[PDB]
């Protein structure tokens, strides 16, 4: 059972294999998996229910396998369309910004997002 929920949408909140990018690297959850808490990093997420796979671009969040086999994924913005150039333009601007200013951390997040997007 997968519970994948966002503030403004609710997705999978059964599912067979879920592939997650986590503080602990990358984690895949299949059936019984020991109950965990993981911070989800800004991510490309794949959720597979049977052979069907849906691919989500995710702003990071939290993942918590519950001991009752409920994979609580909470994230702010997760689909395929979310990945679907402008971000590269933005990163250039944001990089210039790092020179003066928290904004540095923002731009760092942007490098991660651009790379993560580029990965798709």
């Amino acid at each position: 059972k997968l519970q994948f929920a966002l503030p403004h949408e609710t997705l999978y909140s059964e599912v067979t294999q879920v592939n997650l990018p986590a503080k602990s690297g990358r984690i895949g959850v299949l059936a019984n998996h020991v109950p965990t808490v993981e911070q989800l990093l800004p991510g490309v997420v794949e959720v597979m229910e049977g052979s069907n796979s849906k691919k989500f671009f995710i702003s990071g969040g939290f993942a918590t396998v519950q001991p009752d086999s409920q994979l609580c994924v909470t994230a702010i913005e997760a689909p395929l369309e979310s990945f679907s150039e402008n971000i590269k333009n933005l990163l250039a601007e944001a990089k210039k910004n790092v020179s003066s200013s928290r904004e540095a951390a923002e731009a760092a997040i942007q490098v991660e997002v651009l790379e993560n997007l580029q990965s798709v």
């Binding site: 503030p7 403004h8 911070q39 800004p42 671009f57 702003s59 990071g60 969040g61 702010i76 913005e77 369309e81 979310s82 990945f83 679907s84 150039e85 402008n86 971000i87 933005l90 928290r102 951390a105 923002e106 997040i109 942007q110 991660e112 997002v113 997007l117």
Partner: protein
């Protein structure tokens, strides 16, 4: 920088991708003022 502030910034960045909706834009644009208060006086309103 709180962890969820970090995640927040990532979420805002993520709608920059080409495909967009108003509710998303609203989720990426809001304003407020956090105002301090004393044990009385209110240090000057500073935009959130």
């Amino acid at each position: 920088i709180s962890y969820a502030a970090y995640l927040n910034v990532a979420a805002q960045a993520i709608r920059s991708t080409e495909l967009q909706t108003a509710s998303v834009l609203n989720r990426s644009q809001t304003d407020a003022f956090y105002t301090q208060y004393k044990n009385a006086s209110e240090p000057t309103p500073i935009t959130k």
